[PDB]
Amino acid sequence: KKPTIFILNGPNLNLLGLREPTIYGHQTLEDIANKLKLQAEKLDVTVEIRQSNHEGALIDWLQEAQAVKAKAVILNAAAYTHTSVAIYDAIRAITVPVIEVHLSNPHAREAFRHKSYVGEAALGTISGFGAESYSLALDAAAKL
Amino acid sequence: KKPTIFILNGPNLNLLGLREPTIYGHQTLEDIANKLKLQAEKLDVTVEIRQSNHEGALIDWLQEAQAVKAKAVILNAAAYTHTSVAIYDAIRAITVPVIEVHLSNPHAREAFRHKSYVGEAALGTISGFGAESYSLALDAAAKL
Amino acid sequence: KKPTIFILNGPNLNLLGLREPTIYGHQTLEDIANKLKLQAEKLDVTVEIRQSNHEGALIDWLQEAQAVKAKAVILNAAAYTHTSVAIYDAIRAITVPVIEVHLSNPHAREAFRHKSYVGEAALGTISGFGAESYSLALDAAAKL
Amino acid sequence: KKPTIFILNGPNLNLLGLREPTIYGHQTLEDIANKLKLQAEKLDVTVEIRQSNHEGALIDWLQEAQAVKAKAVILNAAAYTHTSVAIYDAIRAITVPVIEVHLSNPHAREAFRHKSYVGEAALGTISGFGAESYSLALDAAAKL
Amino acid sequence: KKPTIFILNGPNLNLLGLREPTIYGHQTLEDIANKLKLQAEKLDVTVEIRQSNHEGALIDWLQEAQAVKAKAVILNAAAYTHTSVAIYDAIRAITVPVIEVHLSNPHAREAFRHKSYVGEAALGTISGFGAESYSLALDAAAKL
Amino acid sequence: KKPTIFILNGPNLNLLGLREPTIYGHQTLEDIANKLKLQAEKLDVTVEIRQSNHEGALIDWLQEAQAVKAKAVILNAAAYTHTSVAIYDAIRAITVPVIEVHLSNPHAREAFRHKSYVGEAALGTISGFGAESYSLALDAAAKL
Amino acid sequence: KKPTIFILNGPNLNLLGLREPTIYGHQTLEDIANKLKLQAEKLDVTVEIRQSNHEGALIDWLQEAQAVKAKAVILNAAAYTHTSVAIYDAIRAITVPVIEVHLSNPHAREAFRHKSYVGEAALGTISGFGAESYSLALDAAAKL
Amino acid sequence: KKPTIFILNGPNLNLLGLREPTIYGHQTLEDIANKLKLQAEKLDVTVEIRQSNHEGALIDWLQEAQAVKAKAVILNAAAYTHTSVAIYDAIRAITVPVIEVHLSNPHAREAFRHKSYVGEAALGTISGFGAESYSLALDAAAKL
Amino acid sequence: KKPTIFILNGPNLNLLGLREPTIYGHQTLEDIANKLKLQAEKLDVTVEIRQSNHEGALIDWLQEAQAVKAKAVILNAAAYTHTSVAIYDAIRAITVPVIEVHLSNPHAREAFRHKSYVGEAALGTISGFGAESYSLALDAAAKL
Amino acid sequence: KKPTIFILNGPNLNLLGLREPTIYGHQTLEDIANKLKLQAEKLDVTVEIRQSNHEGALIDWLQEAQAVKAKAVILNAAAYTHTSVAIYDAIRAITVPVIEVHLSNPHAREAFRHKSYVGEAALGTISGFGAESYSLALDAAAKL
Amino acid sequence: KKPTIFILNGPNLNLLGLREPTIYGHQTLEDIANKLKLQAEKLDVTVEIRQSNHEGALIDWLQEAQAVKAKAVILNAAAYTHTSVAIYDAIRAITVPVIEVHLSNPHAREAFRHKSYVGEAALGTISGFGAESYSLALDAAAKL
Amino acid sequence: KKPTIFILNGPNLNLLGLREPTIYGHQTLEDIANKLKLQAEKLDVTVEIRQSNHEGALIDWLQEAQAVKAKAVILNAAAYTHTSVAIYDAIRAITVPVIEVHLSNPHAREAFRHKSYVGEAALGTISGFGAESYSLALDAAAKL
């Protein structure tokens, strides 16, 4: 049976590479999903990739990953990283390890992004490598 | 004739008694629903019992209870208790009394759980008796 | 096409005028929608008016306004104004101008309502004029 | 032998129902003691009910309850709830379970009352039901 | 003789469009005064427009507006918005409604500008529309 | 009956004048009691003067003043002024007016003495005039 | 020629008893000036009574009092009490004792009024007796 | 001839070695008193050893030690160490040196125990050596 | 006609060397003005030296310096340094460089003087050299 | 030809796997250096691996890496991560990218470890994978 | 074999008794080393006494003490006590017990000295006895 | 002997001018040393100029300046200015006057640079004039 790895994207990440692309970058959330589905072939794992602007959806998906005995979750909660006690509790309640991922380095941004409810509950964090943040997360998650 | 009492459970409470039961406890959210439906027979009230990982669902349900002239709401908002100005506003907007319930004693935990937006708007609070927190809430709610 | 302007209402605003009208003030969210649809005829713009108790819905709608090349968004996030980093990021990610609206003056209320994640990301803010807050927002939004 | 349950009232609760009774309510601390002594007959437990304006008295009484192998303490520390590290330590030092009780909902009042040294050490808390807060506490305490 | 509307500008607004105009913008405080005097003709109100770098002058003018039974004050206290308890008290002491105005969106700027002593006492606030902030304020003020 | 005025002194005021008088200032708590008893003759009021190092004693005495329909309480809670929520509640619960008194000006001292739980509940405050603080309090208290 | 005592009133006190008098009280700032001029005859002192909405005026007047070898200043800085480091420095720089006066008890009001730059530098403070606050201040000031 | 040294124990220390001794330790407060009386023989000093759950008792005892020209006080105020401005004032008012003692290292515990009103006023502090904390204190106190 | 350099002194500096000179120092603000006018001859610049207790005057003068194309402003805002957002904005709005000057080292004083709204906007700061602080400022200002 | 990558370890990491190994883990800092030297062969890069308890050493090494045109630095500043403004400045001053590494997840520990001066200046961060944190860092660093 | 006890002195302690000795005290760091070497003869232990202005040196020495199976460390980190997370980690990593020592009582000084990273990790603390602080530490350390 | 003046540079100042000079500003730390050595000839003083990335080195050098009876220290502690209690204590312990120097205006930067442990202990501060900050410091230092 093939280990399944949830990759869960929070709000606004669906907008990646749309605002003035010849200024803020060309790469989109689908492009990253395509990269990752291929990396998952190289790594011999299936990868279930989802996005929602809803805090509740990320929790449902964390709980769904435990129900399905998933090997790992790679979680980019986006802005909910800094507000969601509920996502912190979800990660702590489930036995499936969670890896926090950010494209940008949140500590290099606004002070309100220094706070990570995900990071307080997760196994680990990879930040600041753009799409490479996901690819590193998926390698580490395969070797768990 | 029969008074209806909403009993609303927030995120992660659906996971009660699942993770390593012979370590973190056997009793489940359904077991508590079954206890409560029986207590509701002894008390001559119907009891509408619901759970969601979605903050918006608890608000919809608070508003639904006012529309239906419900006698009371027993609310365990779980993690949203500590973040939701929106749930605080919903409780204050509606005329139906709200009783805050927690299985655990939140004041005995992490400092971030000392804050209760629910408690700031509710009639009252029962904490720390596990399932008995709900049973006490339902007695008090019947005598309102 | 007449320019389209999204008008997005957050949680509990659907309860406007219902609770004890002879105390909290008669006028309802529909009444305001009706005022606005008529103002929109005088101004030669179409107006898409929505309400949800769900933080995620407001973000979906902000993103949907950019996808549809809407001219403006008038946003009353209600309690989520004070909690939502995710709405702040949605406003910043989209190119459509956002006008913050409040019926009441939030600075005249509880200290926790002094914080506006919407206001930190929006073009501008109109507060405290009840329904006239929306009408002013719609005039300003038409002239953008 | 009959289980004994201490019920300990802190400062100013002795003044309950005296200031302008036909405005702020008729019921007194004795009336509640009388209610509770009768409930204690129904429940087959003896109940030792005390009040003092002295922080030290509540600690002496907590320690006296352990010495006498009391089944439980119901504690309304009143204002000392928000200041007394010493009462927090007393509860934690003794093996007798403590139930926090408040007539009012302290979270609905001044921010300085949100802090509960009792709540940080107690098994549980019942708040906001007036005299019913004690009666619920005594039921829960009997079933311990 | 018509309703009179005071429009009071605090410190540094007199410098609008002067420093490097082909960089920080061409429009001046006089230009806005001229716009507003014309709008006031369309609206059938007299408009008394004043500027001072002195906190005391804005208070004298608020008090003068009450003495003269003005219909409204439009107040852009500029930096004093964030420091002046005295202007907060002046607004609260007088019966004449005050509308807060800002050219810029202060919530989009330095955290020290998030604080508004004016906004805490005023009827309402219009921010972020440049000169349009005043025009909106004057329309709302006429319909009061 | 001559109106009776309680004058209540908190901890350490009993040490006034004892420690190195030729440095800390000669006058003792008895000397002040003697001054006050004489002033009370000139004013036609009886004066009941007490001191305790016990927070609980000051509360008992506040409550005793209401029971005896005393005209006023002059209260120097000394260090308990900065810690006692329970004294704040006692003052608020009783109908007898309380005047706060300090020998020294506490705002001129350590930041922790800037907080006055007494001052937050009392009618009024006289600070910084040594014994004259009491004498002024007794004149004001007689005229109440 | 007699001891001269400056009595300096800060912003908004000029509005005392004007706004809806049959609601917020009938007595005015002139009435208090008249009371005080008469008390000054009984006490054998000249009294110079002034009011300004300008922080700078209160400083000029404090400095003028030192230049004229005044016996004392009675200062009600009103809102500037809570903001003015400059008035704190003026009091500290001059040799003339300053008595802080408030009509209301500021500790009984909004938390921002708990802060007193005047009180941190003054000899003493009388608060909460309305006009009696000034009369007490003038007696204490005469006996200095 | 013999120097007397007060040794004053605050709340809950009377409970030392009682709760489940074969888990939380065997040694009691009396055992430490017995150790100390013997050490006092070797050191040629009389030792007055007392305990109370009452803040006021520790103050009375500090004041009593000054009145009796005691050489030193060894003070373990327990929880009152973190709350008592009154004990801080008592230590500062008296000329008798005070040595702060703790069995445990309070800096190694909860952040609220990092604050020591005793330590802010005392000569010195010995923490974390259990009973040896007292023995060291008594040696240092004898050589003063 | 030469480069002109404004030197602006805020509140209370006019009192330098007056209060008990044989205690707090003999040198006055005029003495420093005389020093500086002579230094200005050596440096080939005109120097306009002003003092006011009014925050508004310092702003008027900063704006006047820009209008007159002054080379530089040397600003000792005294207490307004720690409160004036308005002076911060004036410095930022004008093109003329501002040098902050203090006689004393404010970082060596009360924590409230650590905050410098002037310093946050100025080119540079010279503190702690008494009159030498001005002389250094004028040399640096001439070589700009 | 060969890119050189500095790997810099701060204080106490030299102690990895020493204290009671059959309890707190077997693997040592050398073991990780050996893993990394081998990975560096597979990756075609030389790897300069160093440790110091001295903040100044990590700065010297950051500066040395720029001077030597190193491709990247992998930095585990250990405790200095939470205190060193100087290391933050060193990373910002140099052009060589820095990757922050932690064995443990610092967000899962004491609140003081949530602060990362390294993270505020670095390209990116890998936390919580033990030795795998370094291996991931070295892959990412090779592909830069 | 003789137990060895490290005694480690942080920055500026090397300057003890040099600044105006006939004012701030005659005794030097060597004098204390000489006292302690003699006490160590009485106690049958060898004592290795060191000082550095370098944070890193104290850590190296803590680690060196574990490597050498030292019985104890007596640590006066001086100013690094209030800043050094790295020294806190060093103490916690090593098995050798650490006793915190201060000549002065840090709680009696500036609020920034109330914080002790050493105290948070150490067995215990002796403060405020000058050189006697070391001698007490060495007795306690011998009896470990 | 010519009076000797230590000029001490902290971490990262050694990188001045190196990184992208055509952006960060051409001038190097050597260039400034050369300027200063020449100024020192004009002033008849010798100048001992040093730099280290080590906090401990700056303290050693402060202490070395006192040992050598240096006339003054000019200190640019760079990032350690904002962290070093130990440098604050070194300045306070030595009798040699210290002048704080910064190239940039730290108050114009990140809030964490507003804190100056050097400034809290130093005679005086010169900030924001680049190399001219040192030159002004050396003139002031010669005249001491």
mmCIF file of C-alpha atoms in Angstrom, chain A residues 52-61 63 86, chain B residues 9-12 14 51-61 77 80 84 87, chain C residues 53-57 80:
data_model
loop_
_atom_site.group_PDB
_atom_site.id
_atom_site.type_symbol
_atom_site.label_atom_id
_atom_site.label_comp_id
_atom_site.label_asym_id
_atom_site.label_seq_id
_atom_site.Cartn_x
_atom_site.Cartn_y
_atom_site.Cartn_z
ATOM 1 C CA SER A 52 -9.397 26.665 0.978
ATOM 2 C CA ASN A 53 -9.925 30.211 2.294
ATOM 3 C CA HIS A 54 -11.821 28.508 5.224
ATOM 4 C CA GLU A 55 -10.136 27.819 8.601
ATOM 5 C CA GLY A 56 -12.702 25.050 9.138
ATOM 6 C CA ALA A 57 -11.695 23.278 5.873
ATOM 7 C CA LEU A 58 -8.019 22.971 7.031
ATOM 8 C CA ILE A 59 -9.234 21.414 10.336
ATOM 9 C CA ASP A 60 -11.649 18.979 8.556
ATOM 10 C CA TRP A 61 -8.645 17.987 6.306
ATOM 11 C CA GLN A 63 -8.897 15.252 10.890
ATOM 12 C CA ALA A 86 -8.215 25.717 16.462
ATOM 13 C CA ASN B 9 -19.722 21.766 19.965
ATOM 14 C CA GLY B 10 -16.810 23.496 18.195
ATOM 15 C CA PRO B 11 -13.655 22.173 16.545
ATOM 16 C CA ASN B 12 -11.789 18.959 17.486
ATOM 17 C CA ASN B 14 -15.557 15.282 17.420
ATOM 18 C CA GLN B 51 -20.500 19.882 16.055
ATOM 19 C CA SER B 52 -18.422 21.747 13.447
ATOM 20 C CA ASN B 53 -14.768 22.709 12.934
ATOM 21 C CA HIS B 54 -16.195 25.950 11.329
ATOM 22 C CA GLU B 55 -16.556 29.197 13.343
ATOM 23 C CA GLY B 56 -19.277 30.284 10.871
ATOM 24 C CA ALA B 57 -21.345 27.119 11.620
ATOM 25 C CA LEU B 58 -21.509 27.970 15.388
ATOM 26 C CA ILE B 59 -22.729 31.515 14.467
ATOM 27 C CA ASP B 60 -25.376 30.196 11.978
ATOM 28 C CA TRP B 61 -26.537 27.796 14.796
ATOM 29 C CA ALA B 77 -16.760 26.692 21.180
ATOM 30 C CA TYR B 80 -12.777 29.491 18.980
ATOM 31 C CA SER B 84 -13.934 34.598 18.177
ATOM 32 C CA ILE B 87 -19.203 34.396 18.419
ATOM 33 C CA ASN C 53 -21.187 34.496 9.150
ATOM 34 C CA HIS C 54 -18.114 32.723 7.562
ATOM 35 C CA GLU C 55 -14.679 34.416 7.390
ATOM 36 C CA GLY C 56 -13.862 32.119 4.441
ATOM 37 C CA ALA C 57 -16.918 33.385 2.470
ATOM 38 C CA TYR C 80 -13.835 39.647 11.640
#
